[PDB]
Design a protein around this ligand. Structure first.
Ligand code: CLA
Ligand code: CLA
Ligand code: CLA
Ligand code: CLA
Ligand code: CLA
Ligand code: CLA
Ligand code: CLA
Ligand code: CLA
Ligand code: CLA
Ligand SMILES: CCCCCCCCCCCCO[C@H]1O[C@H](CO)[C@@H](O[C@H]2O[C@H](CO)[C@@H](O)[C@H](O)[C@H]2O)[C@H](O)[C@H]1O
Lengths: 165, 95, 166
């Protein structure tokens, strides 16, 4: 109920009209990577055999020498958060109208500034699928966010289980 | 179990972000501006602050971590030595 | 300087929803009294359908329905601040547009209107209460009992019972 109608400008609007949801576009493509991750299942009866980094047997190729720290996790991790600061640097150097430097004077006549630099530009369909995805990630994704030690084995009865520990 | 040098690796992540500027432009301390002697009026009650100067080496010396932190931490600090060891020196891999 | 009432929309609409649901509530009872035998709490479940599966549970039933009741109810909300319900027969009643000799304010006593053919939400006035206060009655007397009226042999005469609890 946060979007229960409220918000003015640079904070209110400004932060969000595309901006934060245009950054919540990442959320969806993360949940495109993650819903490029979960689809390990998605297709039943599939051909698999095996992989794929499962429960730690011996990483990439063991290295000719004692693995750096220990575990596959820290070696693949440490890098990820430096080689992707690439994008946000570029994504956090913009402005919406014309670009020069920190120029003369450009606030408002007609045309009214602009719109999220990358506005809707129409196609108000990204958002209709956006909050649709957000509502999912946050929502009944908690169908698999509680006690999911098991997996898929439905056996006929009904649906739902009320509340309980 | 504990990556102990997970994080001492980690903290001199950042204070080498400190080896910084003793070197590169001009003097020390962006030369003592205001320290001793007492900038009037402006040291007065105040200044300066600037939400606009978190760049400069964000990109360059964000490598400083992986320096010592790589090949000089878990991978046996400088094996390429020899340079006057007889009143002793060595120095010898506790690792 | 706002002398007195007021209110309006208010809890005249407050009522009729009591009235007409106390009315229904007692359709609840209606059943077990002529060809009689079956009720009280009877904590139903509640009429129960086929011999093809449930089975004590198949689900929180009860719990759900009224998630639905729920946005239908925001809907009547979704009416009474700003008048929107085609028929329009509760908010003042139907007879389309009118009654609102109390919609823009200034009441005091204002009786109201609303059936085209014909008369009114009026002698649906007092079936309105008969049933609210009836419930009052109805789940008054459980808390000790559960049945009405035989003949003049030995029932309707109240023989011997047992305090309130105490
Ligand atoms: C660390 C790294 C760095 C330096 C930043 C830096 C920034 N992020 Mg960011 N982010 C990161 C990892 C990082 N992020 C990861 C792993 C996710 C997932 C996000 C999801 C994210 C969102 C949704 C947003 C940012 C935003 C921002 C900016 C405010 C800032 C430039 C905001 C811009 C906002 O849009 N980030
Ligand atoms: C990474 C990402 C990618 C590219 C894949 C890719 C794949 N997964 Mg997978 N998976 C992931 C994350 C990912 N998974 C995660 C985080 C989990 C937990 C799983 C649990 C999983 C299972 C149980 C299965 C797969 C399977 C598969 C394969 C079909 C395919 C190669 C299937 C083989 C098998 O069904 N995955
Ligand atoms: C990186 C991208 C590139 C791509 C792949 C697209 C793709 C698209 N643009 Mg587009 N566009 C681009 C750069 C691009 N644009 C740029 C640089 C501008 C500004 C110079 C625009 C300004 C623009 C406008 C004004 C519109 C599109 C629209 C469209 C869509 C019409 C597609 C179609 O014909 O099938 C069906 C399409 C998906 C149209 C649309 O209605 O999308 C909402 C229309 O609105 N574009
Ligand atoms: C954050 C979430 C919240 C929201 C917005 C929803 C929304 C929805 N749930 Mg749902 N659900 C929730 C929490 C939520 N649920 C929880 C906590 C549970 C218990 C795990 C369920 C168990 C559940 C079941 C069994 C069903 C739904 C179904 C649905 C859909 C109703 C059928 C339908 O869409 O009709 C028109 C389309 C709807 C999308 C129905 C569905 O997905 O299809 C059968 C299905 O009835 N939900
Ligand atoms: C008034 C209504 C209805 C009813 C009867 C209940 C009843 C209950 N809720 Mg509950 N709840 C409701 C609506 C209701 N809730 C709604 C609308 C919400 C938010 C949408 C919640 C959010 C909520 C939470 C977060 C919790 C409960 C919990 C509980 C209780 C534990 C039940 C138990 O012990 O099972 C055993 C059954 C018996 C002994 C049968 C005899 C329980 C008495 C607690 C719970 O779920 O238990 C862990 C938990 O605190 N509810
Ligand atoms: C929950 C749902 C919601 C959102 C509301 C909301 C409201 N009800 Mg309500 N109500 C509900 C379920 C709900 N009701 C149910 C299941 C019953 C039975 C009632 C019986 C009821 C009555 C009698 C009245 C309301 C009234 C109201 C309003 C005060 C408010 C708009 C009042 C207006 C009053 O008339 N409700
Ligand atoms: C618009 C509705 C109103 C009306 C007209 C009725 C009508 C009826 N209800 Mg009912 N009921 C209502 C509101 C209403 N209810 C409400 C609000 C509740 C919740 C308290 C109930 C809870 C309820 C229960 C538990 C039961 C009924 C039952 C019945 C039926 C008597 C049982 C039967 O077999 O028919 C007799 C048919 C002949 C042809 C004789 C009867 C059709 C009973 C039933 O058997 O199924 C509906 C019983 O199961 N109702
Ligand atoms: C035209 C359409 C239709 C109709 C007849 C209604 C009618 C109603 N809506 Mg509503 N609504 C609709 C579409 C509609 N809605 C849609 C598509 C949404 C999606 C967000 C909503 C979201 C919504 C909310 C959150 C609420 C209502 C509420 C209401 C009721 C109070 C009036 C109001 O809040 O206006 C608003 C008056 C304005 C002057 C809007 C301000 C416009 C900006 C620019 C300021 C009223 C019965 C309220 C209600 O009944 O709450 C219990 C409130 O809850 N609506
Ligand atoms: C229009 C309403 C008027 C009001 C405001 C109330 C209010 C209440 N009644 Mg009530 N009642 C009324 C008329 C009213 N009744 C009528 C006319 C009848 C019969 C026709 C009843 C028969 C009745 C019963 C059987 C019970 C209630 C109970 C209750 C209370 C439920 C909450 C509680 O735990 O009690 C807190 C208790 C008090 C504040 C003590 C006052 C004792 C009386 C008012 C009850 C609540 C104070 C229940 C209860 O548990 O109360 C003890 C339950 O016992 N009422
Ligand atoms: C809505 C806002 C909150 C309400 C609180 C404020 C109430 C208003 C106070 C009234 C202001 C002064 O009003 C004042 O003038 C009247 C006439 O000019 C005077 O009234 C007097 O003169 C009349 C001459 O025939 C007599 O018939 C009256 O009985 C007599 O009371 C009083 O001195 C007083 O009533």
């Amino acid at each position: 109920s946060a979007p229960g109608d409220f918000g003015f400008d640079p904070l209110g609007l400004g932060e969000v009209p595309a901006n934060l949801e245009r950054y919540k576009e990442s959320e969806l493509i993360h949940c495109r990577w993650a819903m490029l991750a979960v689809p390990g299942i998605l297709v039943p009866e599939a051909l698999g055999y095996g992989q794929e980094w499962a429960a730690l047997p011996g990483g990439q190729a063991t290295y000719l020498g004692n693995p750096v720290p220990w575990g596959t996790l820290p070696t693949i991790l440490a890098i990820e958060f430096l080689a992707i600061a690439f994008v946000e640097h570029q994504r956090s150097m913009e402005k919406d109208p014309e670009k020069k430097k920190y120029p003369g004077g450009a606030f408002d006549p007609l045309g009214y500034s602009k719109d999220p630099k990358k506005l809707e530009e129409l196609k108000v369909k990204e958002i209709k699928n956006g909050r649709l995805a957000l509502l999912a990630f946050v929502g009944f994704c908690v169908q698999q966010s509680a006690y999911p030690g098991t997996g898929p084995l439905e056996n006929l009865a009904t649906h739902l289980a009320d509340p309980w520990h | 179990p504990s990556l102990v040098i997970s994080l001492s690796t980690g903290l001199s992540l950042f204070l080498g972000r400190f080896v910084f500027f003793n070197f590169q432009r001009e003097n020390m301390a962006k030369q003592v501006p205001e320290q001793n002697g007492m900038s009037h009026f402006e040291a007065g009650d105040t200044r300066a602050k600037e939400y606009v100067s978190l760049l400069k080496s964000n990109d360059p010396v964000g490598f400083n971590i992986v320096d010592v932190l790589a090949w000089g931490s878990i991978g046996h600090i400088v094996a390429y030595y020899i340079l006057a060891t007889a009143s002793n020196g060595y120095d010898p891999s506790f690792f | 300087l706002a002398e007195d009432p007021e209110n309006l929309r208010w809890f005249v609409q407050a009522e009729l929803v009591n009235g007409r649901w106390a009315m229904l509530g007692v359709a609840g009872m209606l059943l077990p009294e002529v060809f009689t035998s079956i009720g009280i709490i009877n904590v139903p479940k509640w009429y129960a359908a086929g011999k093809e599966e449930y089975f004590a549970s198949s689900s929180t039933l009860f719990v759900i329905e009224f998630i639905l009741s729920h946005y239908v109810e925001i809907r009547r909300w979704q009416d009474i601040k700003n008048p929107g319900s085609v028929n329009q027969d509760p908010i003042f009643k139907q007879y389309s547009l009118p009654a609102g000799e109390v919609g823009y304010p200034g009441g005091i006593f204002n009786p109201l209107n609303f059936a085209p053919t014909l008369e009114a939400k009026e002698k649906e006035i007092a079936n309105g209460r008969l049933m609210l206060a009836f419930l009052g009655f109805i789940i008054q007397h459980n808390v000790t009992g559960k049945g009405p009226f035989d003949n003049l042999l030995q029932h309707i005469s109240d023989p011997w019972h047992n305090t309130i609890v105490q």
